[PDB]
Amino acid sequence: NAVNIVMRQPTTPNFSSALNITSANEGGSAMQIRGVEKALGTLKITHENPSVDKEYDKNAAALSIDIVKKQKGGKGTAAQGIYINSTSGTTGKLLRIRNLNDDKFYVKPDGGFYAKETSQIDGNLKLKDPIANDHAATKAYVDGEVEKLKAL
Amino acid sequence: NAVNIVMRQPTTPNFSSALNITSANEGGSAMQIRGVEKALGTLKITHENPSVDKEYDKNAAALSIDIVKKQKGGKGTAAQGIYINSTSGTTGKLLRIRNLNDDKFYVKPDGGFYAKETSQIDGNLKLKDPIANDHAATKAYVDGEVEKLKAL
Amino acid sequence: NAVNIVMRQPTTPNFSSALNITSANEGGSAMQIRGVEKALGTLKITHENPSVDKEYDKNAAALSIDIVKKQKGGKGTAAQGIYINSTSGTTGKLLRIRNLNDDKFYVKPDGGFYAKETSQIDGNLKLKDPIANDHAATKAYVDGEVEKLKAL
């Protein structure tokens, strides 16, 4: 590697990081990365459990994002967490989530999603009237069928 | 911290970054990170509003991703935005989104998702026939009930 | 830029990275970034296809995340992939996915999502009974209408 940074194991765990980056310039990205990989991530992050115990790292993550107001006097913020785009257009999955090398959840380049297991919304779902037999029925579709039976 | 990089506030905002990384090697990741956190992110990103005004940073994000074709002559790209996996298998949430420390949207390790509020698909939803009373009805399920009433 | 790191094109592709970061300290983030952008990402990642051929980079991504157990003897892991929060509260989209500059999929600050095209769940969807005509019908809602017809 052109540059390698290593933080060795300390005597006792502490809050220090191998690399810390701060910018006070509002007009540019604090950090940028560009690469040209054939078959890998431009940025690869790996979290490894420090412990043999399979629950030890329940509160850890590979990537943690926080979105905050101005420290002194701030009235709030409207900043976004993660923004993904393709200014050229891609035919690849925009977001692809796996576990044990199996596709679990993804977002297609058209915005349609796939979830591998039973899911929950604590609210309503607005969508189009069903075409196929395995499409979700709308209240309209149901009420239209009921109207025809009520007529006879 | 082992290494600290600081960009101070400039007289006028400009496009400069504290750290910029570029690779022209197609065979490896431009950047890699590995850590062993018990209870934190391997990479932590924090966006802070530069202004007291709660709408000032509406177009900002913590993480921005772009996916582009080869600059000169490129016919397109099939690269993915974000790819998440667990080669060991994890029992943690694969994607976990909160606001004000409250779970808003997540993807479970099995691929099932949870959304806290009313959602919208500008299309159809393909899914399984309902088992529970609070499961979404399919067109099949509705049409099966209607068939029995039409019979009598 | 305050710091620029460049890996030039090698004679033959290889696994080397421009920047590689490793920490063995369980008590702190291997890397942290903080910025104050008005209208950009704190971290910006760009993947560019190395080739003119629009399928050449089908297995590449801008961001790749892996979640692993302790290398020797580990029993498993419970770590999360991506964790997003706003300790201040934001009114911005928490996750916003586009292709060709058009909104394809997003998560609102309340946890409600939007998908632009037909989607699939390989399971059931638990949700609330419909209010509007374009809301998905539950099994309860359907069965309630059928009960009234069965009565007459």
The amino acid present at C123, given as its one-letter code, is G
* Residue among C73, C117, C78, C110 at smallest CA distance from C94: C110
Q: Which of B6, B33, B141 sits opposite C142 (nearest CB)?
A: B141
B99:C95 CB<8 A: no
* Residue among B132, A114, B127, B113 at smallest CA distance from C129: B132
Distance CA C117, CA A149 (A): 32
Nearest C-alpha of chain C: how many angstroms from B14?
A: 10
Q: Which residue of C has its CA nearest to B61?
A: C41
Q: At what angle do helices A139-151 and C139-151 cross, to 10 degrees?
A: 10
Beta strands in chain A (DSSP E): 3-7, 19-23, 31-35, 41-48, 61-68, 80-85, 95-99, 102-107, 113-115, 119-121, 125-126
Structural Rg of chain C based on CA atoms: 24
Nearest C-alpha of chain A: how many angstroms from C144?
A: 11
In terms of DSSP H, where are the helices of A40-152? Answer: 139-151
**Residue C125 · residue B125 · CB < 8 Å:** yes
> Cβ contacts of residue B79 below 8 Å, gap of 6+?
A90, A92, B67, C47, C49, C57, C58, C60, C61, C62
Q: Which residue of A has its CA nearest to B15?
A: A28
Cβ contacts below 8 Å, chain A against chain B, sum to: 436
Q: For chain A, which chains pass the contact test of at least 3 CB pairs under 8 Å? A: B, C
Q: For chain B, which chains pass the contact test of at least 3 CB pairs under 8 Å? A: A, C
Strand pairing class (C113-115; C102-107): antiparallel
**Residue B104 · residue B97 · CB < 8 Å:** yes
For residue C26, the tally of other CB atoms under 10 A from its CB is 23
Which residues in chain C have their CB less than 8 angstroms from residue A91's CB? 54-55
Distance CA C111, CA A122 (A): 10
Distance CA B62, CA A84 (A): 11
Distance CA A70, CA A77 (A): 8
Nearest C-alpha of chain C: how many angstroms from A79?
A: 5
Q: Which of B54, B87, B142 sits opposite A141 (nearest CB)?
A: B142
Distance CA A30, CA A16 (A): 20
**Residue C118 · residue A107 · CB < 8 Å:** no
Q: Which residue of A has its CA nearest to B22?
A: A34
